[PDB]
Amino acid sequence: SIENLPAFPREKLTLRLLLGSGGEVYEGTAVDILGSGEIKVAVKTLKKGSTDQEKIEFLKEAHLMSKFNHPNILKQLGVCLLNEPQYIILELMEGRDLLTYLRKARMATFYGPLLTLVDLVDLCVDISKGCVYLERMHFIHRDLAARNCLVSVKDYTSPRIVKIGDFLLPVRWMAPESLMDGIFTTQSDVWSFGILIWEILTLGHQPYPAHSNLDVLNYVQTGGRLEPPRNCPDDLWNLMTQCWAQEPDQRPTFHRIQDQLQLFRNFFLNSIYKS
Amino acid sequence: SIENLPAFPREKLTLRLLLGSGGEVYEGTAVDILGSGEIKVAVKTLKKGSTDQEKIEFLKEAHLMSKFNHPNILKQLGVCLLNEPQYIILELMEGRDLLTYLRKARMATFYGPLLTLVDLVDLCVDISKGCVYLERMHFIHRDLAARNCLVSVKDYTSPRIVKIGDFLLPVRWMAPESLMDGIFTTQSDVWSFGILIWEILTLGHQPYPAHSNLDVLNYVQTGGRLEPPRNCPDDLWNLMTQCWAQEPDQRPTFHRIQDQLQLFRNFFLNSIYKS
Numbered sequence: 291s292i293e294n295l296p297a298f299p300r301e302k303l304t305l306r307l308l309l310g311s312g313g314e315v316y317e318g319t320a321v322d323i324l325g326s327g328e329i330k331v332a333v334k335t336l337k338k339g340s341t342d343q344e345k346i347e348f349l350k351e352a353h354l355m356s357k358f359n360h361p362n363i364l365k366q367l368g369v370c371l372l373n374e375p376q377y378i379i380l381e382l383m384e385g386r387d388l389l390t391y392l393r394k395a396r397m398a399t400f401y402g403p404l405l406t407l408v409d410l411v412d413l414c415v416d417i418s419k420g421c422v423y424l425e426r427m428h429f430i431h432r433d434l435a436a437r438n439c440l441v442s443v444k445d446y447t448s449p450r451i452v453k454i455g456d457f458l459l460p461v462r463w464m465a466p467e468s469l470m471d472g473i474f475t476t477q478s479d480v481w482s483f484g485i486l487i488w489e490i491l492t493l494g495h496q497p498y499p500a501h502s503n504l505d506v507l508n509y510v511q512t513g514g515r516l517e518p519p520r521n522c523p524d525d526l527w528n529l530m531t532q533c534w535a536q537e538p539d540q541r542p543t544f545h546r547i548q549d550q551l552q553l554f555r556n557f558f559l560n561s562i563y564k565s
Numbered sequence: 566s567i568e569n570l571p572a573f574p575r576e577k578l579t580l581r582l583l584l585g586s587g588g589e590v591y592e593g594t595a596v597d598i599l600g601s602g603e604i605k606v607a608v609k610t611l612k613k614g615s616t617d618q619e620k621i622e623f624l625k626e627a628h629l630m631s632k633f634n635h636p637n638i639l640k641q642l643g644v645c646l647l648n649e650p651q652y653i654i655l656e657l658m659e660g661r662d663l664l665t666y667l668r669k670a671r672m673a674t675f676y677g678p679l680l681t682l683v684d685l686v687d688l689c690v691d692i693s694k695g696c697v698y699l700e701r702m703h704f705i706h707r708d709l710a711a712r713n714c715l716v717s718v719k720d721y722t723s724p725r726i727v728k729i730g731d732f733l734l735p736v737r738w739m740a741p742e743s744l745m746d747g748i749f750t751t752q753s754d755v756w757s758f759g760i761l762i763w764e765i766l767t768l769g770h771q772p773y774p775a776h777s778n779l780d781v782l783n784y785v786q787t788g789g790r791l792e793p794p795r796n797c798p799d800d801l802w803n804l805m806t807q808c809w810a811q812e813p814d815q816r817p818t819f820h821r822i823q824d825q826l827q828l829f830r831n832f833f834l835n836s837i838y839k840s
């Protein structure tokens with residue numbers, strides 16, 4: 291099994307909008323990636339004259355995304371690796387990163403958020419499925435957070451899907467074992483997924499708002515956890531709580547996480563119609 | 566121009582669920598109404614041995630709905646008029662009446678409503694279009710209220726459309742001219758449409774909650790109007806306010822009502838993305 295990245299003619303690609311740094315990241319268009327015609331894409335670059343190691347890391351990303359193939363995992367459409375800068379062509383997620391999407395939903399009107407409980411639960415289900423896939427592909431993400439997911443649509447009415455991307459100490463997302471001992475397992479991923487669904491349920495609040503970065507470890511290692519989101523469904527709080535069991539093997543599996551979420555959703559939908 | 570109602574073989578129709586009285590109203594299935602196969606329908610009946618006049622009114626309804634043809638006006642799929650009871654076959658609106666749909670959205674979770682401002686504005690746009698059509702067809706509805714509209718879907722995530730149906734003193738929906746003088750114009754319809762969009766924006770609250778039916782006329786004729794909904798967008802309050810101008814010709818047209826609504830929506834959507 292010799293791996294092969296999907297090559298795409300550079301001539302057909304046109305950069306249009308700079309998004310930021312991460313090389314840099316651009317929005318652009320690309321011809322017949324998928325008859326297809328002119329379709330919009332995100333382009334991750336590799337800065338000219340970067341370290342020899344930096345070029346290897348960039349190619350590691352590319353390989354990972356070639357292997358992955360799942361609705362809730364970001365698709366890599368092509369690569370342009372013959373010239374500098376190197377291009378990784380990603381499907382454009384018009385909703386931007388999940389953290390932004392959540393915040394724009396909250397701070398759009400005081401009349402109320404543009405995302406509802408059902409919308410939010412569907413976001414959690416999407417990621418959980420993604421996490422289940424990655425687990426089955428023996429992959430530990432080691433940076434599960436809203437900032438590292440993307441949303442398909444800019445608006446808040448159209449059907450949407452979330453996908454995991456991104457293949458600094460994020461102390462607020464890190465399991466106690468990770469901080470103290472540098473341990474990173476699927477179970478420590480479950481800790482982070484816990485924090486993520488808290489992010490979703492609070493529409494993109496900062497975890498541990500009352501604590502500096504230096505105070506987070508202190509607070510956690512005395513059994514201090516996040517405060518429940520406003521009106522957070524009990525069933526979802528019990529899931530989050532168990533994601534942050536101090537003992538790693540006391541945390542649920544991603545299969546079970548997806549079970550809980552779908553079951554909760556089923557229950558909630560039924561309660562609507564029965565009223 | 567001789568009118569013709571759409572006849573549908575009675576044998577193919579099967580009643581399944583009673584919905585209530587209004588004859589009575591049923592949910593059921595009907596074969597090849599639209600290859601189509603077995604599709605679900607609502608059935609309005611005419612009670613056996615009812616007044617000769619009652620049978621004429623029933624047929625008046627049928628004729629009206631045959632003429633009307635618009636996305637935001639309820640479709641009549643067929644009639645079974647050869648036997649008793651008489652059947653008017655309506656397209657099934659799984660969301661039920663708008664008033665119910667609104668209430669189930671509010672009282673589903675204290676976490677927050679399952680309908681957002683954008684969802685609600687789209688409901689107003691739908692009706693306004695319907696009202697514009699009926700006006701162009703020289704029709705005065707004379708009972709515009711949430712109870713008389715229907716929603717396409719039961720859930721609160723799937724794309725939805727509202728439609729006008731229903732072709733007792735509803736004092737809370739009635740213009741001052743109507744109550745005092747028995748006047749009913751398109752402009753008095755605009756009054757009611759005002760009250761309707763208040764119903765939508767309050768998720769199905771009762772107008773004038775502090776007033777008995779006997780007190781409503783009193784309160785209105787001294788210039789007393791509804792209190793603004795919580796956090797109601799200013800632009801929408803100004804529209805509602807003008808719908809309830811004491812002088813009938815000081816009220817806006819349905820064309821203008823649709824203008825305001827779409828413009829407001831455009832503005833609001835832009836403000837989202839620009840943030």
Ligand SMILES: CCn1ncc2c1-c1cnc(N)c(c1)O[C@H](C)c1cc(F)ccc1-c1nn(C)nc1C2
Binds near residue numbers: 309315385439
């Ligand atoms: C609508 C355009 N857009 N606008 C903002 C962003 C994207 C955006 C949309 N589709 C992508 N495939 C995309 C970004 O890819 C990058 C590499 C990305 C991935 C990720 F998981 C998390 C954040 C980013 C990111 N990096 N910057 C600098 N910005 C963004 C979000």
Ligand SMILES: CCn1ncc2c1-c1cnc(N)c(c1)O[C@H](C)c1cc(F)ccc1-c1nn(C)nc1C2
Binds near residue numbers: 590655659715
């Ligand atoms: C999901 C089933 N369903 N459940 C409730 C209702 C409908 C329903 C759905 N689709 C229809 N075409 C339908 C009712 O027609 C009737 C005549 C109707 C029209 C209307 F404008 C306002 C209320 C009603 C009504 N009359 N009852 C007694 N109930 C309802 C609402």
